[PDB]
Structures are given as C-alpha cells and as structure tokens.
Amino acid sequence: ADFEVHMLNKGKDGAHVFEPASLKVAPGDTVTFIPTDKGHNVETIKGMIPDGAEAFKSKINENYKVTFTAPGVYGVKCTPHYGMGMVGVVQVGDAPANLEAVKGAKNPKKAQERLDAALAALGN
C-alpha cells in the first residue's frame, strides 16, 4: 500500500510540518513525501530507525517515494527545518521493538515535542 505525506510551510499543527506527522504502515508499504511547498526534504533522524533499516536523505524539493520494510518506529526530519520541529514518525507494524531506543535519541526541543506527540498518536 502507498501513502502520501505533504511537506508544508504551515498546517494545522503550525509552522514547517509534515502532514500527517504520524503514520502506521505495514512492512513493504511506501510513503511518498510530496513537495507541496518548496524548500523541504525528508531524512532519517539518527538513532530513530530500527535494526534492518537504512538511513536516507532526499534532495530539497524532491518528490520522494520510500519503501519501509523493517518493523519499528522511524523518526524523520526535514533537514533545513529540523531545528524548528519539522519532523514525523512512520511506524511499521504493531508493538514496535525499538520504542525505548528511539525515545532516548537526542533532538532539539520543538522536534522532540512533535516526535513525542507523533509517538503518542501512534499508540505508544
């Protein structure tokens, strides 16, 4: 199954957002990060990806389709807007095994707030 995340300068959750900011998928599903507004990208957050996964980083303004295979939670950021909290979580499967490992990852405050909110939205 294929899902979409819009990369936006603003949205319901404020400035510099992924919409949705949380998504539950199954192994092998894809998510396309869409440059609805210019100036964004998507990148894995260090320490917030599960065993079996590989880091990625899209180009600014790239329409970017990612396949998520290994189970667990994946924290993602927009490289330029990470400091302002432009982040999201994609969770592959239920009962993510890496939940405590990713909760320990260091993030600037606005990113941490939104990551914790996304984790809670996903049932964690």
Contacts with Cu ion, residue ranges (CB under 5 A): 40, 78, 81, 86
Cα distance between residue 92 and residue 72, in whole Å: 5
- Supply the minimum distance, in Å, between the C-beta of residue 17 and Cu ion: 8
Contact 74, 92 (CB under 8 A): yes
Q: Which residue is nearest to Cu ion (CB)?
A: 78
Number of other residues whose CB lies within 10 A of the CB of residue 14: 12
Nearer to Cu ion, 73 or 86 (CB): 86
For the annotated binding site for Cu cation, the residues are: 40, 78, 81, 86
Q: In the numeric block, which tokens belong to residue 80?
A: 């330029």
Nearer to Cu ion, 33 or 68 (CB): 33
